[PDB]
Amino acid sequence: SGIALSRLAQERKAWRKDHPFGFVAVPTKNPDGTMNLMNWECAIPGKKGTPWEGGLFKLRMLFKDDYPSSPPKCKFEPPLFHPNVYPSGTVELSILEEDKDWRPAITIKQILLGIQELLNEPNIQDPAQAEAYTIYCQNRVEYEKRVRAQAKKFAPS
C-alpha cells in the first residue's frame, strides 16, 4: 500500500490547496481516529442550469492497494437514480475502468468533475440500471421529473 498512500497523500494536498466550489473529498477516520486514505467521503453538487441543480450527491471513493494502477470504485450513498449508476451505487464511467480510459495520472478532481458531467449527460450506450435507463430511453420528460425530485431530496441545509 506504500505506493498508493504516497499518491493519496499528494491528492489530499492538491485537493486542499484548490478544488471546485461546492465539491467535498475527505478521507474517512479509522476506528482509532487515524486517517484512512483508502476510503474517502465525497459530495458532488448538481450543475447550475440542469435538473440536478440544488442537489448535493454524496459518494464514497474506494481505492485498492495497487492504486494508481487501478481506478477507485466510486459509489453513490445512497444509490442514485441515473442510467449509468448500478443499483449498488457504483458509477459506470470509462475513466473509472482500468481496461477503458483509466490512466494512473487522473486526479480526484478529474474523477469528481467527470462524474458531475455524467450526471446531466447520461451515456445511452453503457446502461448500468434497468429502472433509470428504461425511463431515460422511453420517457425523457418523466426521467427529468424524477431527477428534479431527487435533486430536491438531496438539497443541502
Side-chain angles (χ1 to χ4, degrees), residues 1-12 14-28 30-47 49-151 154-156:
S1 344
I3 292 168
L5 293 173
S6 180
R7 176 61 180 281
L8 288 162
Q10 293 172 143
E11 292 287 329
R12 186 167 94 91
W15 182 271
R16 286 169 62 72
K17 165 151 194 206
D18 177 59
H19 62 262
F21 168 77
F23 283 76
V24 180
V26 306
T28 53
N30 286 309
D32 43 308
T34 72
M35 189 178 52
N36 183 358
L37 277 169
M38 310 303 295
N39 179 335
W40 296 48
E41 273 169 351
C42 308
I44 294 174
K47 211 179 300 158
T50 77
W52 301 81
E53 188 195 356
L56 186 66
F57 303 105
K58 300 193 160 191
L59 161 166
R60 202 168 288 278
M61 204 168 294
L62 306 157
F63 295 92
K64 280 176 60 233
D65 287 351
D66 67 353
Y67 175 77
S69 180
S70 60
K73 178 161 87 219
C74 296
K75 173 217 191 65
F76 284 102
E77 295 180 340
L80 267 202
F81 179 95
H82 188 285
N84 307 122
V85 179
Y86 290 103
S88 69
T90 298
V91 177
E92 192 50 74
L93 179 61
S94 51
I95 59 163
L96 298 186
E97 291 278 356
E98 188 180 292
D99 292 347
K100 296 185 204 204
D101 294 344
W102 172 257
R103 292 184 166 215
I106 294 183
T107 62
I108 292 180
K109 179 173 178 291
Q110 286 176 304
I111 293 159
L112 294 176
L113 282 169
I115 302 170
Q116 191 195 40
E117 168 187 56
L118 179 67
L119 285 187
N120 191 232
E121 292 143 67
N123 187 350
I124 195 158
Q125 304 288 335
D126 77 355
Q129 66 169 266
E131 185 189 340
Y133 182 72
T134 304
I135 306 173
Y136 184 73
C137 288
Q138 281 188 330
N139 196 346
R140 187 70 47 79
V141 168
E142 178 67 7
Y143 173 78
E144 294 305 351
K145 182 180 213 284
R146 293 201 47 182
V147 170
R148 289 199 175 273
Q150 186 166 242
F154 299 124

